[PDB]
Write a protein that binds this ligand. Sequence first.
Ligand SMILES: O=c1[nH]c(-c2ccc(Cl)cc2)cc2c(F)cccc12
Ligand SMILES: [Zn+2]
Length: 208
Amino acid sequence: GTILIDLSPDDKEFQSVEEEMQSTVREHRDGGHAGGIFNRYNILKIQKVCNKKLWERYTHRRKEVSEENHNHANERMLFHGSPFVNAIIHKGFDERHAYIGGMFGAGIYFAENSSKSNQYVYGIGGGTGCPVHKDRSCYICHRQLLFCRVTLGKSFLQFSAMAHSPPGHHSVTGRPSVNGLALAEYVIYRGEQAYPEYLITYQIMRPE
Ligand SMILES: O=c1[nH]c(-c2ccc(Cl)cc2)cc2c(F)cccc12
Ligand SMILES: [Zn+2]
């Protein structure tokens, strides 16, 4: 049921998505080991992901959460990087897309920093890099990230350097508490709480 609709680079939607992608790159504590060395991306394509069934599944759950949280879904737009991006856009999020060894337990992880999600495009820790060159800092191969609509509801705040949500909460927020520049990360425990709205195709760019 999924179709992908290409956005024109002249479209304001393309432009606002590209800006969120570019402006949320930061330095990482691994010095680029997992995701590569770059300060910016070359955006090749942005597509809108359209699937009526998956959208209805998302809004149904969003309404349940909202009604449990004084009519506030606490919806964010967040990045997700995964080797399973092709399954996600066709079948939605589910337990198979969880990060089992994540620091907030087995759930589905999202980032405010696009460069954090970039670390997972080729697997946990960048795996072995691109399939063609075996290079985690490959500047040639095309990568994909999802920019997703995520319902957090009442989020459990974890201050910090598929399982269940902590009782009485709909998500967990990983607040950065050592790296002063890092943005937050978030975890949901039900795949119906995210919709994969934009597929972004890009390369990381070698600093000049
Ligand atoms: O985008 C993310 N993806 C993942 C991740 C996705 C799939 C697998 Cl198989 C493992 C980790 C993990 C992750 C994280 F731990 C923090 C912030 C963002 C992300
Ligand atoms: Zn490559």
